[PDB]
Symmetry: C3
Subunit: 31 residues, 3 copies
């Protein structure tokens, strides 16, 4: 469960970093 938990958390965090970049891109587009 632990490694499975850690794996899911790492995955999620990477999903989050990605969304941060997307949001950064969007802010620049709208200005």
């Amino acid at each position: 469960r632990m490694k499975q938990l850690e794996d899911k958390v790492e995955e999620t965090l990477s999903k989050v970093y990605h969304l941060e970049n997307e949001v950064a891109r969007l802010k620049k587009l709208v200005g």
Copy 2:
């Protein structure tokens, strides 16, 4: 504590999934 953590991680995943959908709709709107 492990079960509370796993539930928390699931809930976080659900919030992230919703965020992706919001960002996706935004990218469609602004281009």
Copy 3:
């Protein structure tokens, strides 16, 4: 191990809440 995992989950949820706020602010700027 669990503690550092809890820390990473809390840091991830903090980024999520922030992103939700950015998304709400974009949505008001777009349509």
